[PDB]
């Protein structure tokens, strides 16, 4: 009775746009309209040998010629402007409604169950602290991923617009906010009251974000790389394709979701160490770890696999409902 779905799939509510990096000077911070985009340049590198070598079967004269030579290659490193101190990241993340109304329903009884569970976990557990996870661990600008490293002051300006007009105009300073523990902020509770007005289907909400890392002049970045699968043979020159919008530098939405999908310290191992990206199987791509392994019971794919039969997770539900928000 009431088996799991044969093929379930949920829409990514709480969606995410692309970023267009563009560079600015402070006290010209407010006038970010004619701020020019940052074209992905092309450096050309000569290599070295920092990689460790094998320990099975060798000959010690190979590293004389290998460690001698230069396997040189071109790298399309996106570099700032000459006389520009600030930065830019223009992303309208719009939050869809319907936290658990599906997109595929391989059994309608399971759909009535899961709508019952959005009714419970949206009726009982208020989304105050829920969207305080999706804001207080994404206003502290994990938005800006590797370019967050040693900013002078990375200022996030989450404007919000009905229309061409914009009413919710909240400004921040994301270096005053940690990335390991969410601390009590009033305006962060306003923005989480607004994503409260988003995920629980109250209003059209698209948050036009304009993050300004005030780092320095011509320094490098952390733009999202493309790939070199069957294109390292026709060109065979580039090795790091920093992906582009029309004439600018992307941050791919794929990276941009675990800026905001980084929600839960509700994992198995850590306490205040690691706040990973709230996923099915909770796997981070960096560490090659599997937080919340199969043998543990903190899977997303054990949260309705137990909750759809026995109704007990008890506030690890949030890392089993936010696995369904995206």
């Amino acid at each position: 009775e009431r088996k799991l779905d044969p093929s379930d799939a949920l829409m990514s509510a709480g969606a995410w746009a692309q970023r267009d990096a563009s560079q600015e000077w402070p006290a010209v911070t407010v006038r970010e309209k004619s701020v020019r985009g940052t074209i992905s340049n092309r450096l050309k590198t000569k290599d070295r040998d920092p990689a460790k070598l094998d320990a099975s079967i060798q000959s010690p004269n190979l590293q004389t010629v290998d460690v001698a030579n230069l396997p040189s290659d071109a790298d399309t490193l996106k570099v700032r402007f000459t006389l520009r101190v600030l930065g830019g990241a223009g992303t309208p993340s719009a939050c869809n409604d319907a936290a658990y109304r599906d997109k595929l329903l391989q059994t309608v009884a399971t759909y009535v169950n899961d709508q019952g569970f959005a009714e419970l976990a949206r009726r009982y557990a208020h989304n105050l602290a829920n969207a305080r996870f999706l804001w207080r661990n994404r206003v502290g600008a994990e938005a800006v991923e590797v370019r967050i490293n040693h900013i002078r002051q990375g200022e996030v300006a989450r404007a919000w617009r009905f229309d061409a007009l914009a009413i919710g105009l909240r400004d921040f300073k994301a270096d005053a906010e940690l990335d390991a523990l969410a601390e009590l902020i009033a305006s962060g509770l306003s923005g989480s009251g607004h994503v409260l007005l988003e995920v629980v289907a109250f209003a059209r909400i698209g948050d036009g974000q304009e993050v300004f890392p005030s780092q320095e002049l011509i320094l490098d970045k952390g733009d999202k790389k493309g790939q070199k699968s069957k294109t390292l043979y026709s060109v065979r020159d580039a090795a790091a394709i920093h992906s582009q919008k029309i004439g600018n530098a992307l941050r791919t939405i794929d990276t941009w979701y675990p800026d905001e999908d980084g929600l839960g310290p509700i994992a198995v191992e850590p306490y205040g160490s690691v706040t990973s990206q709230g996923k099915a199987y909770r796997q981070p791509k960096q560490k090659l770890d599997f937080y919340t392994l199969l043998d543990n019971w903190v899977l997303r794919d054990e949260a309705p696999a137990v909750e759809q039969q026995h109704y007990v997770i008890a506030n690890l539900i949030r890392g089993g409902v936010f696995g369904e928000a995206e």
């Binding site: 790939q227 390292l232 043979y233």
Partner: protein, 78 residues
Amino acid sequence: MKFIKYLSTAHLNYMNIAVYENGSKIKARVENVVNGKSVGARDFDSTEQLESWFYGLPGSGLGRIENAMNEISRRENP
């Protein structure tokens, strides 16, 4: 059957090389990591050859996984 490590960070297709040993030979069963249905494998000598011809294929980095995948999937050995 007597499973060992992969070849270097699948995916790119949800497909993997997924080298695993046999008692005498070593099978290289190019497969998914989800439900389990593979495409054609290839049986040959030990790991000492596996890294040898695996490094003997063109491309750099991920393209060696991919060109190795297309090289195994048009197999000769049943």
